Design a binder for this molecule. Structure first.
Ligand SMILES: Nc1ncnc2c1ncn2[C@@H]1O[C@H](COP(=O)(O)OP(=O)(O)OP(=O)(O)O)[C@@H](O)[C@H]1O
Ligand SMILES: [Mg+2]
Ligand SMILES: [Mg+2]
Length: 303
C-alpha cells in the first residue's frame, strides 16, 4: 500500500504573530519544547521517524508501548516526544540528557494515516477530529487546543510556561517537508546562541557566556538556571579537555563575575532564553536551554 511512512518529512511552521488570529479560522496548539517525531503504529508495533527522515525507534524504548491501546489500528502520527521538568513543562535539556529512569511522553498533534486512509489531503479540522476519536480515553496523549482567540490562547500558553503557540489553519492540508504559511509559530521568549568561556562550581553552578568579537568573547552574562544533575556531569567532561589559563573574553571579567572561575577555550556553543539585552550587552533573565554541538563559535552572532 502506497502511503509511504518511510518517505515522510514533518510539516514546518512560519514565525509569526498569533494574537490577532481568530479561533473560527485557526487551531491554537501549545508549543512543546521536545523532539519532533513521526510515528507509525501498525497494529501495536511502533516505528519512529526523525525529522531528518531516519529510523530512531531504538533511541526511545520508552515509546515502544505507545500504541498498546491501538492494536486494532494502523496509524501514522505526528507529535513531540517530551520530558517534563519539575513544573510539568517539557524540557529540551532533560530530553537531550535523558537516562533510563527518564520518562519520555509522546504528545500527538496530527493524524496522517488511519486504517488504510491517507489524510494528507484532509483538512486539519477533520484530521484532528479523527485524532480525537482515535485517542479518547487511551494512553495516547493528544493535548487539546487552547481556548479563545489568538491573544487569549497566547496568554494562557504563557501562564502554563509553555514555549509559545502554534496556530494551524483549520482548513489546511498537511504538506510533508514544507514550511507553510498555514502554520504560524509564536514563541514567548527570545533565544540566543552563546560561546562558553568559563564555569563556576555550585561541580558547575553556572557558566560564563560570550559572543565572539574582534578581541575575543564579549561577555554576555552568567547562566545558572535550567541545569541539573545529569547534564552538569556531562558538561564537566566536555569542559575538562578545554581547560586553559588564558581568559577568552575581550576584557578581564569584573571581579564578581570571575570569582572561582576556570576558563575554557572558546569551543562549546550553547543556547539560552532571555528577556532582553542590557544596554551594556548582557542577557537579562537568562536560562539554560541546552548545548548546540551542531554549531561552532565562528557562527555565533548577536541575534
Ligand atoms: N504543537 C506543535 N505542532 C507542531 N510543531 C511543534 C509543536 N510544538 C513544538 N513544535 C516544534 O517545535 C519547534 C518550535 O519552533 P522553533 O522556532 O523553536 O523551532 P526551530 O528549531 O527554531 O525551527 P524549525 O521550525 O526549523 O524547527 C518547531 O520545530 C515546531 O515544529
Ligand atoms: Mg525550539
Ligand atoms: Mg526544531
Amino acid at each position: 500500500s502506497m502511503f509511504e511512512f518511510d518517505n515522510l518529512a514533518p510539516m514546518l511552521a512560519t514565525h509569526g504573530t498569533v494574537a490577532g488570529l481568530k479561533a473560527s479560522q485557526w487551531a491554537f496548539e501549545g508549543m512543546w519544547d521536545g523532539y519532533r517525531l513521526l510515528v507509525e503504529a501498525d497494529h501495536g508495533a511502533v516505528r519512529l521517524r526523525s525529522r531528518s527522515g531516519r529510523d530512531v525507534t531504538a533511541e526511545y524504548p520508552q515509546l515502544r508501548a505507545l500504541a498498546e491501546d491501538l492494536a486494532d489500528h494502523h496509524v501514522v502520527l505526528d507529535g513531540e516526544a517530551v520530558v517534563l521538568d519539575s513544573s510539568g513543562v517539557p524540557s529540551f535539556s532533560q530530553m537531550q540528557n535523558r537516562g533510563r529512569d527518564t520518562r519520555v511522553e509522546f504528545w500527538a498533534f496530527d493524524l496522517l494515516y488511519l486504517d488504510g486512509r491517507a489524510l494528507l489531503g484532509t483538512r486539519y479540522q477533520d484530521r484532528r477530529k479523527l485524532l480525537e476519536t482515535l485517542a479518547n480515553a487511551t494512553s495516547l496523549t493528544v493535548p487539546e487546543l487552547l481556548p479563545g482567540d489568538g491573544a487569549q490562547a497566547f496568554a494562557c500558553s504563557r501562564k502554563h510556561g509553555w514555549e509559545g503557540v502554534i496556530a494551524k489553519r483549520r482548513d489546511s492540508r498537511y504538506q510533508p517537508g514544507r514550511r507553510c504559511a498555514s502554520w504560524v509559530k509564536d514563541k514567548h521568549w527570545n533565544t540566543q546562541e552563546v560561546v562558553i568561556g568559563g564555569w563556576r562550581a555550585g561541580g558547575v553552578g553556572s557558566l560564563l557566556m560570550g559572543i565572539p568579537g574582534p578581541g575575543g568573547l564579549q561577555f554576555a552574562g552568567r547562566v545558572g538556571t535550567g541545569l541539573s544533575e545529569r547534564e552538569l556531569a556531562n558538561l564537566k567532561e566536555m569542559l575538562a579537555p578545554l581547560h586553559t589559563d588564558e581568559s577568552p573574553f575581550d576584557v578581564p571579567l569584573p571581579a564578581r563575575d570571575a570569582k572561582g572561575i576556570t576558563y575554557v577555550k572558546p569551543a562549546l556553543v550553547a543556547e539560552v532564553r532571555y528577556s532582553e539585552w542590557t544596554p551594556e550587552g548582557r542577557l537579562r533573565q537568562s536560562s539554560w536551554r541546552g548545548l548546540r554541538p551542531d554549531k561552532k563559535p565562528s557562527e555565533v552572532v548577536r541575534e
